[PDB]
Amino acid sequence: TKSTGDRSRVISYAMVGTMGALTAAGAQATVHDFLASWSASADVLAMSKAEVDLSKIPEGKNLVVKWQGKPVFIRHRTPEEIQEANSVDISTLRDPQADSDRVQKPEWLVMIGVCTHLGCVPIGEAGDYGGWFCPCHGSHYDISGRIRRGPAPLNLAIPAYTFEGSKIIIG
Amino acid sequence: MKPVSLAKYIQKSPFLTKLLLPISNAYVHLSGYRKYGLRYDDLMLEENDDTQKALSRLPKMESYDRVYRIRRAMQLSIENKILPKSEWTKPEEDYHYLRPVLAEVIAERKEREAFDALIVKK
Amino acid sequence: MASSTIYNIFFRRNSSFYATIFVSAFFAKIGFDVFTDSVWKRANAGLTWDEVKPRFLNKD
Amino acid sequence: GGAAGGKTYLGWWGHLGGPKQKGIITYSLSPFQQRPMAGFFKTSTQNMFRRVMTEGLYVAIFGIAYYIYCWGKERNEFLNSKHGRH
Amino acid sequence: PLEKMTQECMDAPDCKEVKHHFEECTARVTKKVEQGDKSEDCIEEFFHLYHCARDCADPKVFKVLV
Amino acid sequence: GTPKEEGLHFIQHDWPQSKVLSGFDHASLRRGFQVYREVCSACHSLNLIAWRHLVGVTHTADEAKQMASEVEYEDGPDDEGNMFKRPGKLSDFLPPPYPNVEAARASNNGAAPPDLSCVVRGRHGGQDYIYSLLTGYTEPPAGVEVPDGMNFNPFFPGTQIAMARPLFDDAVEFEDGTPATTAQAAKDVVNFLHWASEPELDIRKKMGFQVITVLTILTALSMWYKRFKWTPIKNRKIFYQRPIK
Amino acid sequence: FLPPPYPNVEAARASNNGAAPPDLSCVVRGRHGGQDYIYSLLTGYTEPPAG
Amino acid sequence: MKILKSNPFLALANNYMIDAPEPSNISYFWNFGSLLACVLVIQIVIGILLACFYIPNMDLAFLSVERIVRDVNYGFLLRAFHANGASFFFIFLYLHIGRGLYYGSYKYPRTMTWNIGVIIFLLTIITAFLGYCLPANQMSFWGATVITNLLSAVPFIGDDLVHLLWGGFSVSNPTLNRFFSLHYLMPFVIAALSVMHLIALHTNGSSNPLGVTANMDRIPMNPYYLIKDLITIFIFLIGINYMAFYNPYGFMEPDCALPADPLKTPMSIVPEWYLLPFYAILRAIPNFQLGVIAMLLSILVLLLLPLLDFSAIRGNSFNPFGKFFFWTFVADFVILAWIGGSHPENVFITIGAIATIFYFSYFFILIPVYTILGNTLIDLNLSSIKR
Amino acid sequence: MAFYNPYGFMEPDCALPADPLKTPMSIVPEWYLLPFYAILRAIPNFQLG
Amino acid sequence: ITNLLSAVPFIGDDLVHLLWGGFSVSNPTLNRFFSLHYLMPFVIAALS
Amino acid sequence: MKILKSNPFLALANNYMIDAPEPSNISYFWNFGSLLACVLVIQIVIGILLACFYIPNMDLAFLSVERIVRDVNYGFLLRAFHANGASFFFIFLYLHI
Numbered sequence A: 001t002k003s004t005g006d007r008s009r010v011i012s013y014a015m016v017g018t019m020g021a022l023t024a025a026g027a028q029a030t031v032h033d034f035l036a037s038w039s040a041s042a043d044v045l046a047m048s049k050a051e052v053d054l055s056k057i058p059e060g061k062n063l064v065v066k067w068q069g070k071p072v073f074i075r076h077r078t079p080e081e082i083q084e085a086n087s088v089d090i091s092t093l094r095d096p097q098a099d100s101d102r103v104q105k106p107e108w109l110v111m112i113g114v115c116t117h118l119g120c121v122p123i124g125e126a127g128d129y130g131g132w133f134c135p136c137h138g139s140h141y142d143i144s145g146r147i148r149r150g151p152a153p154l155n156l157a158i159p160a161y162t163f164e165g166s167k168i169i170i171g
Numbered sequence B: 001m002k003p004v005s006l007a008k009y010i011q012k013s014p015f016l017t018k019l020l021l022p023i024s025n026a027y028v029h030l031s032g033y034r035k036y037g038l039r040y041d042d043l044m045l046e047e048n049d050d051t052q053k054a055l056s057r058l059p060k061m062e063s064y065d066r067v068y069r070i071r072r073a074m075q076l077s078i079e080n081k082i083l084p085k086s087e088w089t090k091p092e093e094d095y096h097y098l099r100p101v102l103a104e105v106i107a108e109r110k111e112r113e114a115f116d117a118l119i120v121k122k
Numbered sequence C: 001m002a003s004s005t006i007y008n009i010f011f012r013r014n015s016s017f018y019a020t021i022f023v024s025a026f027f028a029k030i031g032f033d034v035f036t037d038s039v040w041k042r043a044n045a046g047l048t049w050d051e052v053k054p055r056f057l058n059k060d
Numbered sequence D: 001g002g003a004a005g006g007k008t009y010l011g012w013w014g015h016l017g018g019p020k021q022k023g024i025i026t027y028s029l030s031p032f033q034q035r036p037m038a039g040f041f042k043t044s045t046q047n048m049f050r051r052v053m054t055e056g057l058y059v060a061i062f063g064i065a066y067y068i069y070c071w072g073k074e075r076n077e078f079l080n081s082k083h084g085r086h
Numbered sequence E: 001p002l003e004k005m006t007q008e009c010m011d012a013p014d015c016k017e018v019k020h021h022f023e024e025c026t027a028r029v030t031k032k033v034e035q036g037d038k039s040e041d042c043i044e045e046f047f048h049l050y051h052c053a054r055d056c057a058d059p060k061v062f063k064v065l066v
Numbered sequence F: 001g002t003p004k005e006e007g008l009h010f011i012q013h014d015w016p017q018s019k020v021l022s023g024f025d026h027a028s029l030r031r032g033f034q035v036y037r038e039v040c041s042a043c044h045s046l047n048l049i050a051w052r053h054l055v056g057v058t059h060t061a062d063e064a065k066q067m068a069s070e071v072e073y074e075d076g077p078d079d080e081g082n083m084f085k086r087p088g089k090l091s092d093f094l095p096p097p098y099p100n101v102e103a104a105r106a107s108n109n110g111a112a113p114p115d116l117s118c119v120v121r122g123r124h125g126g127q128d129y130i131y132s133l134l135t136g137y138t139e140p141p142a143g144v145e146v147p148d149g150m151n152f153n154p155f156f157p158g159t160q161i162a163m164a165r166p167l168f169d170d171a172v173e174f175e176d177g178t179p180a181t182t183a184q185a186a187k188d189v190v191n192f193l194h195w196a197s198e199p200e201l202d203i204r205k206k207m208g209f210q211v212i213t214v215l216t217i218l219t220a221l222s223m224w225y226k227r228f229k230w231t232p233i234k235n236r237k238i239f240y241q242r243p244i245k
Numbered sequence G: 001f002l003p004p005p006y007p008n009v010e011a012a013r014a015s016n017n018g019a020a021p022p023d024l025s026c027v028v029r030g031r032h033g034g035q036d037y038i039y040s041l042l043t044g045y046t047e048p049p050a051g
Numbered sequence H: 001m002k003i004l005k006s007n008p009f010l011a012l013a014n015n016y017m018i019d020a021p022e023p024s025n026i027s028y029f030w031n032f033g034s035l036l037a038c039v040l041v042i043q044i045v046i047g048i049l050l051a052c053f054y055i056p057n058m059d060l061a062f063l064s065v066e067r068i069v070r071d072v073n074y075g076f077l078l079r080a081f082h083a084n085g086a087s088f089f090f091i092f093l094y095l096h097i098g099r100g101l102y103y104g105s106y107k108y109p110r111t112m113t114w115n116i117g118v119i120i121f122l123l124t125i126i127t128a129f130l131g132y133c134l135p136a137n138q139m140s141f142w143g144a145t146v147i148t149n150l151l152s153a154v155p156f157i158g159d160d161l162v163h164l165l166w167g168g169f170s171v172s173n174p175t176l177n178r179f180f181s182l183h184y185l186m187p188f189v190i191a192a193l194s195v196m197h198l199i200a201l202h203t204n205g206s207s208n209p210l211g212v213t214a215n216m217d218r219i220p221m222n223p224y225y226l227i228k229d230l231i232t233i234f235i236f237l238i239g240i241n242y243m244a245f246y247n248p249y250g251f252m253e254p255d256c257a258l259p260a261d262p263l264k265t266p267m268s269i270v271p272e273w274y275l276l277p278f279y280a281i282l283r284a285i286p287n288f289q290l291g292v293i294a295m296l297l298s299i300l301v302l303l304l305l306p307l308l309d310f311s312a313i314r315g316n317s318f319n320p321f322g323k324f325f326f327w328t329f330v331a332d333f334v335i336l337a338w339i340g341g342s343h344p345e346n347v348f349i350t351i352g353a354i355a356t357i358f359y360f361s362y363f364f365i366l367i368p369v370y371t372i373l374g375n376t377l378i379d380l381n382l383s384s385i386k387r
Numbered sequence I: 001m002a003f004y005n006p007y008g009f010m011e012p013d014c015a016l017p018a019d020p021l022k023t024p025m026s027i028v029p030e031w032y033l034l035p036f037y038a039i040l041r042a043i044p045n046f047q048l049g
Numbered sequence J: 001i002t003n004l005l006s007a008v009p010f011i012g013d014d015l016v017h018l019l020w021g022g023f024s025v026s027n028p029t030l031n032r033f034f035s036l037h038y039l040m041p042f043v044i045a046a047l048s
Numbered sequence K: 001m002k003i004l005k006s007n008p009f010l011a012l013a014n015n016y017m018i019d020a021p022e023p024s025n026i027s028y029f030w031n032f033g034s035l036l037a038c039v040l041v042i043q044i045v046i047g048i049l050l051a052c053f054y055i056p057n058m059d060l061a062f063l064s065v066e067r068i069v070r071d072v073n074y075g076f077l078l079r080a081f082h083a084n085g086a087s088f089f090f091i092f093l094y095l096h097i
Ligand SMILES: CCCCCCCCCCCCCCCC(=O)OC[C@H](COP(=O)([O-])OCC[N+](C)(C)C)OC(=O)CCCCCCCCCCCCCCC
Pocket: A019, A020, A021, A023, A024, A027, C011, C012, C013, C014, C017, C021
């Protein structure tokens, strides 16, 4: 060693430590990149979203669009349906939900349009309560979208849509 | 089975021996086990009963010298070097220190290889 | 001081050794990322989409 | 414990199956005292030079293989031409 | 751009012998096909001459195609 | 066999993607995409490149969406069955020009225009062969003839290709104002096709450099440590004291 | 295969109000009772009771 | 007694990886087994990952592979690593076989290890074919059609076996389903046979370049040979990463990026490069049954080696004739591969026939003759030295 | 069991194609995992279950 | 059953999406399940 | 020495199947380990064949199973045997536990 002790030991341990540090740095990237292939691919991501242009639906009209296989209706409620929908007592519903918090904008009502009882396509602008009506099992959904009578257990589902000007993105 | 070298057949004719001596000298120089100091008889395989028995009938000094030779050869082969030109195995020390014992053991084994096959011709 | 303190702190117990290894790896990843990003950016001069945007986009 | 196995040639430490040794002395040094990469370039260069000199011709004469490759390729290309079908 | 340079190296002094061979062929083949025979062509000589011309022309015009 | 039935060897070029550290020249990519759309999309098909594959490479999101909104696609059943049409979206593939192989064969004599998604990687020569093919339509030599509908191209195997000369002078007007000739357009479209073959070149070449550097450093350190640890064996001394009886 | 009366499920839904005639290939094995349930359903149409 | 020598599983690990006597002068050519194990592990993991995105059918396999390439997150790494590792596997296998052949490791007491290795080689060759036939490109379709038709050479039940393997009358959905199902199973059998390989080897230990007994000098494997293999591992990694990140389709022919058209016959129907010499041997013989017989024998002849070496020495370190003839055979093997790769033209037929003749002569005529000659020359010179 | 009653261990709601809108009356796993499902539904809380 | 992974405090509701390979039970889920079901019995045999 | 006690593979087989000291009064409830092993072997062998006709895709998985059941030669045997063996595995597992 041509020198004193306690010096080559430090050098060798430093080389080993650099070895280990670089090996761990490589292994982390290897594992993360080779396991990230299990996440959502581009093809699946491209189908995730859905766009609806609300400018083509005037007040008191319905547009049916597709979103992940579940149709979702939009309705531009006039202040009338807004005010009777807010008038109903929450606790009197079969499934108690309000309406002020049920829609981000009270002039726009967007719900997932499948029968909550056995998964059928209801007909809108009908029923005893003036909303969506399911002739598959003879049940009626109110104008606000909730269930009033019939074999449907719970209310209609609400999508996680976001508003951007005149275009709404569903997803 | 076993090596079938036919040098005995060649040695019957002195013409062939005289012709082939330089070729044999060149071949033994080319094989190059002397560069490690080994004898030719250290390279034969020892994994059967005959050789393992023969190695137990060697004089003690011969066994110790063989052990030293093999250890030195291995230590040389570890670091990829050879002995200098003055320590190479001379032809005088390259004799057969294992062939007679192995031949005796093989003869004893062959001796028994006959009584079992014995038949009565009547 | 000298080289004894370095051994005493880092390479004395196994636990400190492993902790130093892991922290050094964590910082070395970022260092190599920065170095390769700089090298790649200086390698491609004038032939990237963000560089060539003002030759196509603005004249619409 | 388990069973008496067959006849092998390794054993383990202590009973390695080798011959009886006598009068052998071995020295060494601690790896933390010796300087690594000492006598490396000289020894490696000498060993490589010796290896090239001695086992060189056993490999060099890959020599006729390249020539037969080149001749075969050239002749095959020549025979697939206008003057090769005459 | 490329066709012009190809035509220049078609007659530049670096492919003169292959150009001469191509001309000799074309003369012979035109005469033979005029007589009536239809069993000879020199796509091979055209191949050689075209490769020479392209070797000349392509790199010296690919550096301007920006 | 005979070179007439094998095709003349292609011409070697130099491209930005050939360098060890360089990637892609994106202006040439946009020019090649324009040339393909306006001269090639009539007969060939590229049904493996989506509209979303272009945003960030040769177009932005708004430009890609506006371009894709022009074309029309079929959009499944609705209510009482039926098959309606819809404007294009940002997740649809490029529209093929022909419905099936039979229609494509019928339209262009009896030849089927091959799909161009992976034609650069599927040809012996790469970009060079395609570029030499597009700019190799010469007058037939002496002694050879061409049947009706067949064209002469030495680079094509057999020197007979059933594709009339696709590119001509000033066929397209590039946005940047480059003088569009046959050679420049051919080079740009070859670059675009090569991008379409392997669209991940930039990222792959970027990570390869860092991986190689780290591996080199680790290899050097490993060699040094191996040299260090094996010292007490490579430097032994053996002495034989002869056992005198 | 035997011809399906409708080209897709949506046409079937449109024709028969809002219902959807289930496929009969594997219905017997997929109902709680099988043959007995199917036969009883076929032969069990009666006028409703009062109320 | 320490824990590592007491607990069963830890003792199993220790007896094979930590405490195991080894020859003290084994060169760098003894590391290829660890490289083979690492490559096999990489292949198993990568194949398991790739099986989560592949649909085995005629009309969906190629599209699934393309979707893997350009849509799945980091799919290009997966596919390139699988292909390049499968290519490197045969390189390391050939190097392992060459190491075993040069130093005469087939001799006793390691014959069982040699036979197990030969069986593993055959299994690996079979596994490679099914693996490459999956993407259903042009060469995969046509090469599978050509190769699976070789089963008709057996007398009796000739075309019946071909129909049973095809699951129909031509390469279609069922045969791809069969091939995908079988390609998953074979690597596990290969791993089990590798475990058997190691357990058969461990009973007697490794050899050394010198060729003499190594019982006098031994060192444990734990500190020394666990660090001599790291260099080879890192070198292999640096070799494979360059291919995966700068030339992924390196060993890959141009005709392997097109859909399988069953109407256009390609100009050349060739398998992957690592199977080329056996294809050349098969194509050399004009007869049909003789062709498949010779192709099988070209790999089955490695079992006849132990009873063909009449040499008192064990290896080629001290065998002047062996060193020459080994490299001659290697050159002949390379020539065979080159001939098999190219077209079956005029002169190439003669060259391939001559190369095949030499390949089958080397194993059957040259070895005994030169071993006997070396033994005779050495014995004569030693006998004629005292007088 | 395989020659005289193959679907004898099988619930009747398994001979129908999966309709992602048809909600079944009862959602249960196979019989050999039933006790753990019973244990899971007992606890009113979610994570505790 | 797959929704039970949401009980994890921090990375909950993300492991579920990673396992699903999307937003609901679709083609990638079936592919992954087939591959894992093929793989696991050999591990079980080794454990036995 | 006997060959079964000498060859390493035959020694491994012998030490676990041929000559293994066992208690002399174990009842019939100690017979379920072999049953479990045989059931597992049957499951693996049958599943290898079952994987030869299955297409792993949500849109096309049920029709593949139906084709296995009613179109392949003796496919119903394969399907029923796989399902019923998977069921019997848990019965024998519970008995073992
Ligand atoms: C399944 C879990 C994997 C397994 C993940 C964990 C296992 C790591 C794999 C390598 C294991 C190497 C074991 C070597 C024996 C050992 O543990 O000793 C610790 C050595 C230093 O030991 P030393 O040389 O004797 O000095 C110590 C001096 N004292 C403190 C005692 C006074 O210090 C070291 O050995 C540091 C080695 C590098 C540690 C950094 C992590 C890098 C490995 C993880 C990332 C790569 C994973 C690759 C997997 C193929």
